[PDB]
Design an enzyme around this catalytic site. Structure first.
Site, PDB file in Angstrom:
ATOM      1  N   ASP A   1       0.787  -1.234   0.000  1.00  0.00           N
ATOM      2  CA  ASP A   1       0.000   0.000   0.000  1.00  0.00           C
ATOM      3  C   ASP A   1       0.818   1.282   0.000  1.00  0.00           C
ATOM      4  O   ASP A   1       1.836   1.517   0.662  1.00  0.00           O
ATOM      5  CB  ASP A   1      -0.955   0.086   1.202  1.00  0.00           C
ATOM      6  CG  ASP A   1      -2.263  -0.693   1.059  1.00  0.00           C
ATOM      7  OD1 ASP A   1      -2.765  -0.890  -0.053  1.00  0.00           O
ATOM      8  OD2 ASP A   1      -2.807  -1.093   2.079  1.00  0.00           O
TER       9      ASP A   1
ATOM     10  N   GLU B   1     -17.328   0.734   5.997  1.00  0.00           N
ATOM     11  CA  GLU B   1     -18.491  -0.151   5.956  1.00  0.00           C
ATOM     12  C   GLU B   1     -18.985  -0.610   7.320  1.00  0.00           C
ATOM     13  O   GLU B   1     -18.207  -0.850   8.234  1.00  0.00           O
ATOM     14  CB  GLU B   1     -18.144  -1.378   5.113  1.00  0.00           C
ATOM     15  CG  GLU B   1     -17.754  -0.949   3.714  1.00  0.00           C
ATOM     16  CD  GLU B   1     -17.065  -1.986   2.848  1.00  0.00           C
ATOM     17  OE1 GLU B   1     -16.451  -2.915   3.358  1.00  0.00           O
ATOM     18  OE2 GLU B   1     -17.143  -1.868   1.637  1.00  0.00           O
TER      19      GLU B   1
ATOM     20  N   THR C   1     -22.338  -2.381  -2.582  1.00  0.00           N
ATOM     21  CA  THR C   1     -21.273  -2.635  -3.551  1.00  0.00           C
ATOM     22  C   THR C   1     -21.521  -3.898  -4.428  1.00  0.00           C
ATOM     23  O   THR C   1     -22.617  -4.465  -4.364  1.00  0.00           O
ATOM     24  CB  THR C   1     -19.989  -2.671  -2.689  1.00  0.00           C
ATOM     25  OG1 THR C   1     -18.889  -2.665  -3.580  1.00  0.00           O
ATOM     26  CG2 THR C   1     -19.863  -3.883  -1.854  1.00  0.00           C
TER      27      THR C   1
ATOM     28  N   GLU D   1     -21.941   1.008  -5.636  1.00  0.00           N
ATOM     29  CA  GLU D   1     -20.622   1.141  -6.192  1.00  0.00           C
ATOM     30  C   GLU D   1     -20.225  -0.177  -6.808  1.00  0.00           C
ATOM     31  O   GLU D   1     -20.854  -1.202  -6.580  1.00  0.00           O
ATOM     32  CB  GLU D   1     -19.602   1.450  -5.117  1.00  0.00           C
ATOM     33  CG  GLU D   1     -19.951   2.693  -4.310  1.00  0.00           C
ATOM     34  CD  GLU D   1     -19.026   3.044  -3.154  1.00  0.00           C
ATOM     35  OE1 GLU D   1     -18.195   2.246  -2.741  1.00  0.00           O
ATOM     36  OE2 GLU D   1     -19.134   4.155  -2.662  1.00  0.00           O
TER      37      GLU D   1
ATOM     38  N   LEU E   1     -14.561  -3.780  -7.466  1.00  0.00           N
ATOM     39  CA  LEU E   1     -13.216  -3.805  -8.033  1.00  0.00           C
ATOM     40  C   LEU E   1     -13.173  -2.961  -9.294  1.00  0.00           C
ATOM     41  O   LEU E   1     -14.197  -2.733  -9.949  1.00  0.00           O
ATOM     42  CB  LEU E   1     -12.815  -5.259  -8.344  1.00  0.00           C
ATOM     43  CG  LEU E   1     -12.545  -6.188  -7.158  1.00  0.00           C
ATOM     44  CD1 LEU E   1     -12.395  -7.593  -7.707  1.00  0.00           C
ATOM     45  CD2 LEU E   1     -11.311  -5.766  -6.375  1.00  0.00           C
TER      46      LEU E   1
HETATM   47  O1  LIG Z   1      -6.413  -3.455  -2.509  1.00  0.00           O
HETATM   48  C1  LIG Z   1      -7.262  -4.454  -3.058  1.00  0.00           C
HETATM   49  C2  LIG Z   1      -8.650  -3.899  -3.422  1.00  0.00           C
HETATM   50  O2  LIG Z   1      -9.363  -3.611  -2.180  1.00  0.00           O
HETATM   51  C3  LIG Z   1     -10.740  -3.180  -2.291  1.00  0.00           C
HETATM   52  O3  LIG Z   1     -11.604  -4.253  -2.738  1.00  0.00           O
HETATM   53  C4  LIG Z   1     -12.317  -5.075  -1.770  1.00  0.00           C
HETATM   54  C5  LIG Z   1     -13.697  -5.326  -2.422  1.00  0.00           C
HETATM   55  O4  LIG Z   1     -14.393  -4.098  -2.431  1.00  0.00           O
HETATM   56  C6  LIG Z   1     -14.489  -6.430  -1.705  1.00  0.00           C
HETATM   57  O5  LIG Z   1     -15.663  -6.731  -2.432  1.00  0.00           O
HETATM   58  C7  LIG Z   1     -13.634  -7.691  -1.583  1.00  0.00           C
HETATM   59  O6  LIG Z   1     -13.281  -8.117  -2.900  1.00  0.00           O
HETATM   60  C8  LIG Z   1     -13.295  -9.497  -3.216  1.00  0.00           C
HETATM   61  C9  LIG Z   1     -14.247  -9.648  -4.394  1.00  0.00           C
HETATM   62  O7  LIG Z   1     -15.533  -9.201  -4.028  1.00  0.00           O
HETATM   63  C10 LIG Z   1     -14.270 -11.106  -4.848  1.00  0.00           C
HETATM   64  O8  LIG Z   1     -15.079 -11.226  -5.990  1.00  0.00           O
HETATM   65  C11 LIG Z   1     -12.851 -11.603  -5.176  1.00  0.00           C
HETATM   66  O9  LIG Z   1     -12.397 -11.033  -6.411  1.00  0.00           O
HETATM   67  C12 LIG Z   1     -12.354 -11.899  -7.561  1.00  0.00           C
HETATM   68  C13 LIG Z   1     -12.974 -11.169  -8.757  1.00  0.00           C
HETATM   69  O10 LIG Z   1     -14.321 -10.916  -8.473  1.00  0.00           O
HETATM   70  C14 LIG Z   1     -12.861 -12.011 -10.047  1.00  0.00           C
HETATM   71  O11 LIG Z   1     -13.366 -11.326 -11.180  1.00  0.00           O
HETATM   72  C15 LIG Z   1     -11.402 -12.344 -10.259  1.00  0.00           C
HETATM   73  O12 LIG Z   1     -10.671 -11.120 -10.499  1.00  0.00           O
HETATM   74  C16 LIG Z   1      -9.792 -11.132 -11.636  1.00  0.00           C
HETATM   75  C17 LIG Z   1     -10.076  -9.857 -12.480  1.00  0.00           C
HETATM   76  O13 LIG Z   1     -11.335  -9.949 -13.151  1.00  0.00           O
HETATM   77  C18 LIG Z   1      -8.938  -9.673 -13.490  1.00  0.00           C
HETATM   78  O14 LIG Z   1      -9.143  -8.510 -14.280  1.00  0.00           O
HETATM   79  C19 LIG Z   1      -7.607  -9.596 -12.709  1.00  0.00           C
HETATM   80  O15 LIG Z   1      -7.688  -8.587 -11.663  1.00  0.00           O
HETATM   81  C20 LIG Z   1      -6.615  -7.640 -11.523  1.00  0.00           C
HETATM   82  C21 LIG Z   1      -7.216  -6.240 -11.708  1.00  0.00           C
HETATM   83  O16 LIG Z   1      -7.825  -6.148 -12.981  1.00  0.00           O
HETATM   84  C22 LIG Z   1      -6.120  -5.175 -11.542  1.00  0.00           C
HETATM   85  O17 LIG Z   1      -6.691  -3.883 -11.713  1.00  0.00           O
HETATM   86  C23 LIG Z   1      -5.436  -5.331 -10.166  1.00  0.00           C
HETATM   87  O18 LIG Z   1      -6.303  -4.890  -9.093  1.00  0.00           O
HETATM   88  C24 LIG Z   1      -5.744  -4.010  -8.089  1.00  0.00           C
HETATM   89  C25 LIG Z   1      -6.536  -2.687  -8.223  1.00  0.00           C
HETATM   90  O19 LIG Z   1      -6.171  -2.050  -9.425  1.00  0.00           O
HETATM   91  C26 LIG Z   1      -6.275  -1.748  -7.043  1.00  0.00           C
HETATM   92  O20 LIG Z   1      -7.128  -0.630  -7.163  1.00  0.00           O
HETATM   93  C27 LIG Z   1      -6.494  -2.467  -5.703  1.00  0.00           C
HETATM   94  O21 LIG Z   1      -7.919  -2.813  -5.564  1.00  0.00           O
HETATM   95  C28 LIG Z   1      -8.604  -2.619  -4.288  1.00  0.00           C
HETATM   96  C29 LIG Z   1     -10.066  -2.215  -4.545  1.00  0.00           C
HETATM   97  O22 LIG Z   1     -10.037  -1.040  -5.309  1.00  0.00           O
HETATM   98  C30 LIG Z   1     -10.863  -1.975  -3.232  1.00  0.00           C
HETATM   99  O23 LIG Z   1     -12.231  -1.755  -3.532  1.00  0.00           O
HETATM  100  O24 LIG Z   1      -5.643  -3.645  -5.666  1.00  0.00           O
HETATM  101  C31 LIG Z   1      -5.941  -4.649  -6.684  1.00  0.00           C
HETATM  102  C32 LIG Z   1      -5.105  -5.921  -6.377  1.00  0.00           C
HETATM  103  O25 LIG Z   1      -3.705  -5.717  -6.450  1.00  0.00           O
HETATM  104  O26 LIG Z   1      -5.004  -6.687  -9.934  1.00  0.00           O
HETATM  105  C33 LIG Z   1      -5.977  -7.739 -10.125  1.00  0.00           C
HETATM  106  C34 LIG Z   1      -5.237  -9.061  -9.963  1.00  0.00           C
HETATM  107  O27 LIG Z   1      -4.499  -9.043  -8.750  1.00  0.00           O
HETATM  108  O28 LIG Z   1      -7.368 -10.857 -12.097  1.00  0.00           O
HETATM  109  C35 LIG Z   1      -8.338 -11.217 -11.082  1.00  0.00           C
HETATM  110  C36 LIG Z   1      -8.003 -12.643 -10.644  1.00  0.00           C
HETATM  111  O29 LIG Z   1      -6.669 -12.713 -10.191  1.00  0.00           O
HETATM  112  O30 LIG Z   1     -10.875 -13.021  -9.113  1.00  0.00           O
HETATM  113  C37 LIG Z   1     -10.891 -12.269  -7.884  1.00  0.00           C
HETATM  114  C38 LIG Z   1     -10.159 -13.090  -6.814  1.00  0.00           C
HETATM  115  O31 LIG Z   1     -10.586 -14.441  -6.847  1.00  0.00           O
HETATM  116  O32 LIG Z   1     -11.929 -11.327  -4.110  1.00  0.00           O
HETATM  117  C39 LIG Z   1     -11.897  -9.963  -3.623  1.00  0.00           C
HETATM  118  C40 LIG Z   1     -10.950  -9.925  -2.457  1.00  0.00           C
HETATM  119  O33 LIG Z   1      -9.674 -10.282  -2.920  1.00  0.00           O
HETATM  120  O34 LIG Z   1     -12.439  -7.383  -0.877  1.00  0.00           O
HETATM  121  C41 LIG Z   1     -11.564  -6.424  -1.538  1.00  0.00           C
HETATM  122  C42 LIG Z   1     -10.291  -6.329  -0.690  1.00  0.00           C
HETATM  123  O35 LIG Z   1     -10.558  -5.723   0.554  1.00  0.00           O
END
Ligand SMILES: OC[C@H]1O[C@@H]2O[C@H]3[C@H](O)[C@@H](O)[C@@H](O[C@H]4[C@H](O)[C@@H](O)[C@@H](O[C@H]5[C@H](O)[C@@H](O)[C@@H](O[C@H]6[C@H](O)[C@@H](O)[C@@H](O[C@H]7[C@H](O)[C@@H](O)[C@@H](O[C@H]8[C@H](O)[C@@H](O)[C@@H](O[C@H]1[C@H](O)[C@H]2O)O[C@@H]8CO)O[C@@H]7CO)O[C@@H]6CO)O[C@@H]5CO)O[C@@H]4CO)O[C@@H]3CO
Length: 490
Positions: free
Chosen positions: A96, A181, A337, A375, A378
């Protein structure tokens, strides 16, 4: 009119736009970005107002200057603002960028009294937020945790009265736990959680342990203890005694505990929103809270991730509509969310139901007659993410001959970044803003689409917890269209 179909779009500002030293670092840079947003039709922006930057020096030592220069620039750029009263830590994990702790003077009290922090069974202290157990404990140099929050919001209202009067701020979202939250810190990446671990119960500090034992003694079971069989953060529910088929969650002890644990959040939420209503009374502002979208294990009977977070939601017990009912006496907005997520995107073994969770929570809110906003969880830049947000924003489509039967009050897109502003990405975002606006041009006057904000009325009377808990009766969700009629297109 079609303008009665308009749902406003806000964009979340970059993290640390005023830094931990209370310096609005790059006015010029933010300004070019904001003006891009204004030209793309965006209605407003959202910012965290971090308690750890503002009241850093000591009790009631507020410095509002750098947030005043930020609000001034947002107003010059023609955007409205949603302000979050962020009483939680920004970042702080390995990797971070911006790390803003809660005030050091609060952390110093925590050095001598570790039980002011949420604590798991292992005795690990999470320092992101103050436990609901100290909400009414006068241990922070004579103040309770809710007086600190109340005082902060009154000082914001007085010192930003000119931006409030001139209508820059649409709503005040009040931070109610980790990440802002209303929940327990049940899935801390700082303690090794990884999706889709069921998380852990966070009720082991001495104030909540003490309260629980007093409560089980009054229910006739003084011998009942806090769970010892619910496993660890990264467990799966069937490998635990508490969440397996016919496990402890379904016994008298398990149900009593889960009711107590989830009731602590409703009351925490209700009492601080009481103070927020007082602080902002008379202002042309709406109040909001953020509920977390915890979709993993939603598709199994036990809903384990939801239950460790404090949402006592089962297939036969609605754990979200009591929160909507509580918000109605405060005339507040439920900001949720996961609005962008499809079930098909989740790993199969997570038993993940984001689409169904969303339909249950927004239907619960419209049934209780409150306003619902949301919202994305991700960062997403693709058309399939945007079309899912447009579908949840207007579940039964556009009404050609009036307002939609069901529509969200607004959607905040998470985060303004250089990636969003990249050319092919921003072209798709502009089409998303258009379709959210139901193909109408940006509409500056909210009154035209029936979003005028009145003076904040005083909270309606306290609703007793048993009337709150009648909203646990399961209802069938409103009908959703398969896909939106206002498509961005691929
Ligand atoms: O710092 C991390 C993150 O924190 C906040 O997010 C929280 C969120 O609000 C909660 O809902 C929960 O999230 C969990 C989520 O709900 C679950 O679904 C799961 O996620 C899975 C995805 O749903 C699924 O689609 C898949 O994801 C794949 C993506 O589709 C694919 O594109 C890629 O992902 C990469 C991203 O595209 C890329 O941008 C990068 O992400 C980073 C962000 O850019 C950065 O802003 C930050 O994000 C915050 C977020 O903004 C908060 O809201 O850090 C990110 C991570 O470094 O990297 C991604 C890859 O690492 O690949 C993925 C698959 O690898 O699978 C996932 C996982 O199975 O899990 C979520 C928790 O991990 O909690 C989070 C965290 O508190």
């Amino acid at each position: 009119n079609m303008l009665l179909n308009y749902v406003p779009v806000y964009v979340m500002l970059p993290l640390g736009v005023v830094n931990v030293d209370n310096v609005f670092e790059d006015p010029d840079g933010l300004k070019e970005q904001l003006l891009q947003l204004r030209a793309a039709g965006v209605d407003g922006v959202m910012v965290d107002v971090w308690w750890g930057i503002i009241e850093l020096k000591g009790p009631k030592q507020y410095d509002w200057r750098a947030y005043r220069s930020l609000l001034q620039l947002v107003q010059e750029c023609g955007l409205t603002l949603q302000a979050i009263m962020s009483f939680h830590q920004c970042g702080g994990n390995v990797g971070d960028i911006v790390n803003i702790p809660i005030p050091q003077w609060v952390l110093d009290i925590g050095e001598s009294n570790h039980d002011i922090f949420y604590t798991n069974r292992s005795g690990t202290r999470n320092k992101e937020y103050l436990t609901v157990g100290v909400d009414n404990e006068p241990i922070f140099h004579g103040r309770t945790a809710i007086e600190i929050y109340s005082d902060y919001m009154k000082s914001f209202r007085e010192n930003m009265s000119d931006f409030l009067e001139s209508g820059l701020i649409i709503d005040i979202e009040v931070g109610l736990g980790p990440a802002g939250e209303l929940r327990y810190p049940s899935y801390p990446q700082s303690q090794g959680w990884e999706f889709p671990g069921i998380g852990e119960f966070q009720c082991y500090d001495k104030y909540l342990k003490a309260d629980f034992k007093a409560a089980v003694a009054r229910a006739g079971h003084p011998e009942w203890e806090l769970p010892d069989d619910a496993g660890k953060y990264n467990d799966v529910p069937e490998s635990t005694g508490f969440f397996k088929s016919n496990g402890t969650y379904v016994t008298e002890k398990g149900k009593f505990f889960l009711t107590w644990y989830s009731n602590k959040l409703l009351n925490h939420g209700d009492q601080i929103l009481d103070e927020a209503n007082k602080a902002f009374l008379g202002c042309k502002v709406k109040l909001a809270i953020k509920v977390s979208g915890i979709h993993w294990w939603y598709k199994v009977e036990n809903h384990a991730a939801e239950l460790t977070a404090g949402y006592y939601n089962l297939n036969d017990r609605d754990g979200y509509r009591p929160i909507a009912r509580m918000l109605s006496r405060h005339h507040a907005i439920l900001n949720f969310t996961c609005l962008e997520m499809r079930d098909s995107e989740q790993p199969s073994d997570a038993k993940s139901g984001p689409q169904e969770l969303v339909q249950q929570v927004l239907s619960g809110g419209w049934r209780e007659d409150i306003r619902v906003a949301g919202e994305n969880a991700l960062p997403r830049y693709d058309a399939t993410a945007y079309n899912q947000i447009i579908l949840n924003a207007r579940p039964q489509g556009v009404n050609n001959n009036g307002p939609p039967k069901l529509s969200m009050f607004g959607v905040t897109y998470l985060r303004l970044s250089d990636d969003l502003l990249q050319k092919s990405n921003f072209n798709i975002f502009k089409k998303f803003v258009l379709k959210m606006h139901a193909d109408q041009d940006y509409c500056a006057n909210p009154q035209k689409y029936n979003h005028a904000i009145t003076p904040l009325k005083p909270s309606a009377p306290k609703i007793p917890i048993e009337v709150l808990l009648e909203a646990t009766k399961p209802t069938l969700p409103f009908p959703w269209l398969p896909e939106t009629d206002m498509k961005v297109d691929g």
